[PDB]
Symmetry: D2
Subunit: 307 residues, 4 copies
């Protein structure tokens, strides 16, 4: 298909509340962020939950109980639940929302890696909540763990529930890790490969980095994968644009970037969706509907989730 | 400078009038086309002249005599004259407009090559004028000659007058050909390098082709060049977008593509300038004014031309 | 096949006899060079003729009349005749030897280009014959002409005799030119693609240049091409090695480089064949025999030529 | 310098003794392996220790006590100690040898990653010691931890003893992680960058993977890094060859590959040094002596160590 799938990651677990008043924190804010992103043109909504009180990341399925059914009734957009949450968290817990809610899509980080969030402390030096500075400073000695055993376990369990994955690949090794699983017939096509650029601990944001992730994926998966680009921070729209211009899909959201322009905070997820849509439109491309995305990605349908 | 220079090539010598009623032909059309593109945001107007009776290319300086002053009186956009014109034509004669008019910019094809235009005879079967079919078929057996001696001659002759060049580079060899002249101290920075993609006889339009040209230019010239992208035909906006997303400048225009969208003919050069501007705006980038383009390219000034 | 085909180009038309006493000139020297290179392991001998009195290039078939049958009676190596000769020569004159001798292989330059030989005048300043300096200096205003019409003519005329081609591609555009002919069905597989690096007027000799020719050829031709590398001068063995290590075939010979090591003239063609064989053996690869080359390239056989 | 530094990794912690009777286990074997490699041309010996009763990896400084002085007394080859050892082991234990012996070089893995060793159980089914199968199977569920804090600690601690590092970069993210520390001035040039290809959990062995690692490094470090290539298993010689041909340094050894040719076990480490030297010689390059490698790498000297 020539339609462009816009995934919008509304809040995540990396950014903290003190960085931007626009980062969704409460169940209502997450729901509104999502419906607005979807209304703006996002076919897939990539969701994390946070504590309505202080915004700290939470993977308790309780935290999703309110917004999921609310999003589902307010938009046909595809709900995509994180199996990652915060890198500080631990496995099997991380999988509760996905295992409980049995979503059409869940995110799967394709390899253990460092996540260097501490440099954000050079831009943000004062925080409303104590957990914020800690979350960033402790990133320095934490490993985001997704071993070959962890990945196999997620694939079997969630796959068993009709849940397909957004394979988050932060470097060439992640595409090769995915290839390993594909060869073992543990994942079935099409593979939704979200190539992530610009995070310390992952591949950088250079145009050469993007071209290499594409040539690798093309060589390893051929016609069996569906490509999406995720550029962190300021690289969000330019890397998405480069990919859009050559047939890729795009991912935006306050989870990945807090900005709408140099030195200007994005007020809503929808704003970012709008901006990538101006590029998509200039390229004479059309944005994919949730129905189109479901077809392109081989998803189970909204009537088949536990919510 | 983070500003994007938009070059608009208004008519050229490749397309023929029977392929689109919007291709400018007469001096008034060429002038209106240029003025409108400049007002849409083009800082540089790349110009060829056509015979007003049948639209065939002509490098007779008399053919530019009316439209040149008319453009100059209505816009401060930089006038860029071609030193090629038609590959059917010969050298030093090819230089008459640039040597006479002493423009701020002149284009310079960086190497002898084949120009395969004959395949257009498969989309366009009926022509109003006899020359059109012949122009296209005769490209099969002709070489666009730009020898190392010819290039040296153009660099010396036009450069002596303060004319700077739009170095038209159709393949890697052209970049290496320019480095040869830079190493002989026959060209001085900044080098306005227009990498041209998608013409039979030149490099193709794949994203790998574009990344190759950039990495070569980066290695050969470092910070001493100013990069512009020209994608032929349907590749105009996609390749320009890829470049613009990574700091490059852009070239549009009916000389290069007759289209505004799939199967939809562009009514004006301005429309193509508006189309690439949606992408430039999506990227939160600004368009360079003619004054800014002059500074970026080291040009002599709108008043310092012989028209 | 994992066997490596070694082509040896014994004299060429670029180098001049005053540059090295080891450059073959007379029919006896050419035959000895050829036989020696075949005995060293070259399965393909790429041939030009020179005038025995002064070494000047000549495409007169009479100039090949002695050495050709002598090489044929002494080795089963594949004889590959140039259709390029000297770029100073005219076309169809260039074709006399290949059309008369109906060889198994003929070289075919895939596009018009500049051929800058004049910088060699900076290293070689004394010449025994006046034509030598002239040959070099005059390359400055020379186009090496191989229009789309010329290539079509050679393909049809030589191809009609069962002659297959060593497609000499000096840049990306040449690979795209070849795909144009493959699509029009004017050339049948396998395609023996000789990617040529390091000639002024061609693509350079950077590892990036080699990697780009390969990825382009792979995309355009898939499994239908047989790849060979030709690195000019000092790049001969380094580039051939980078290629051999990833499945390529290799071209060596005094036509392409006069050197065996830095500042050290190669005394024979054989010496260069032995140097690449050292690399091939280090890689645990084997050299293809003439019979094996013939199978890999679909050749008509040593007895099926007109000499 | 155009001299090639050959690093020989004599045993490592990946391979198990049941895999090859030639894998060095005892102090005597390690020392003779190291001296033979140096005699064959290795300027740098990359060392791990094994428990001599069962060959299991051990980072007890006591396991190095005999071989280090034996090696130092018989060769000037630079001693390079591992800081990884077995990915099963912990961090304080990992650093004892380097911190105690204060070698001129120590290896430093540049990012936490999965190490997929379990596929080797498809080739090796029978093991002499119980630890061997467990070593391989437990790789499925273990992370090789090298956090941003860990790396900072190693740089400060070992750096303080004059020890310089062989930065083992298994993917693009590792080069970027090194750039982070270089920007923080926590490592001084020249940086010995050992790019590692072909391990499940790291970047693969494709020529493109290699070109991208060089392009990334060239861009991040410019002239401030010294490049070495490590291809795992069968990719050992081809990838080293590709690097050697373009000015890089090379790494061989039974730690990295058990083979000397397809299906033929390497009898010694020295056999592998000889094999890459066939390529080096074919390329007309010379091997660096230990004195030369010390200059190239800015090393402290063979007597400035604690053994
Ligand atoms: Zn997420
Ligand atoms: Zn033009
Ligand atoms: Zn030749
Ligand atoms: Zn090691």
């Amino acid at each position: 298909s020539r339609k462009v799938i816009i995934t919008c990651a509304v809040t995540g677990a990396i950014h903290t509340p003190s960085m931007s008043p626009y980062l969704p924190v409460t169940p209502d804010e997450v729901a509104q962020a999502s419906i607005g992103a979807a209304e703006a043109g996002a076919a897939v909504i990539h969701l994390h939950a946070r504590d309505p009180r202080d915004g700290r990341p939470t993977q308790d399925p309780a935290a999703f109980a309110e917004f999921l059914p609310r999003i589902k009734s307010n938009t046909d957009a595809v709900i995509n639940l994180t199996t990652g949450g915060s890198p500080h968290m631990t496995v099997e817990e991380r999988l509760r929302p996905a295992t409980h809610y049995m979503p059409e899509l869940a995110s799967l980080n394709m390899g253990s890696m460092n996540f260097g969030l501490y440099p954000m402390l050079e831009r943000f030096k004062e925080f409303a909540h104590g957990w914020e500075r800690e979350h960033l400073e402790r990133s320095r000695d934490l490993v985001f763990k997704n071993t070959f055993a962890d990945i196999e376990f997620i694939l079997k369990t969630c796959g068993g529930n009709g849940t397909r994955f957004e394979f988050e690949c932060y470097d060439t090794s992640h595409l090769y890790n995915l290839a390993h699983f594909v060869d073992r017939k543990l994942a079935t096509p099409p593979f939704f490969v979200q190539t992530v650029f610009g995070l310390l601990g992952g591949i950088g944001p250079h145009p050469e980095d993007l071209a290499h992730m594409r040539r690798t994926a093309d060589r390893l998966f051929g016609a069996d994968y569906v490509w999406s680009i995720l550029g962190a921070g300021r690289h969000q729209i330019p890397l998405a644009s480069i990919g859009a211009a050559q047939g890729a899909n795009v991912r935006v959201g306050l989870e990945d970037s807090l900005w709408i322009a140099p030195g200007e905070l994005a007020e809503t997820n929808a704003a970012q969706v709008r901006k990538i849509r101006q590029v998509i439109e200039g390229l004479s491309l059309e944005v994919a509907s949730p129905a189109e995305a479901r077809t392109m990605l081989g998803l189970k349908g909204p009537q088949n989730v536990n919510f």
